[PDB]
């Protein structure tokens, strides 16, 4: 109901380009370069993790009748989607502590910065 549409498969061709120039320009000079795209660049990746995150209790919507369809066990996709969402959202918690003033850029916690 939610995912044999093509709309959904066209927005999610085209959601990785966004996606990577939103992770890409992760670097503190171009930070300091243009603060509004600081500013801006939390609010477009939140509402990209609102469009990202239900597709993951969508499942129990619509679950096929066929045993195995989704599986972790049998399917890697849906096992490796979870694991960018979840580093993904372990970024997101760093990025919440990085508007505050509790850590900063020269922090030993961005070798899990790598997996966007």
């Given amino acids: 109901l939610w995912i044999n549409k093509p709309w959904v498969h066209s927005l999610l061709r085209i959601c990785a380009i966004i996606s990577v120039i ?19 660049t939390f609010t477009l ?8 995150t239900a597709e993951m209790i969508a499942k129990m919507h619509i679950r096929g009748i066929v045993k195995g369809d989704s599986s972790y066990v049998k399917d890697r996709w849906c096992v490796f989607d979870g694991f960018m969402v979840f580093c993904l959202w372990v970024s997101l918690v760093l990025q919440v502590f990085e508007i505050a003033d509790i850590v900063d850029q020269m922090s030993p916690w961005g070798m899990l910065r790598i997996p966007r």
Wanted: net charge negative; with cysteine; charged share 5%.
């Fill in 22 to 40: 939103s992770v890409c320009m992760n670097t503190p000079m171009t930070f300091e370069h243009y603060p509004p795209l600081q500013y801006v």
């Fill in 45 to 52: 990746d939140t509402l990209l993790m609102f469009l990202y």
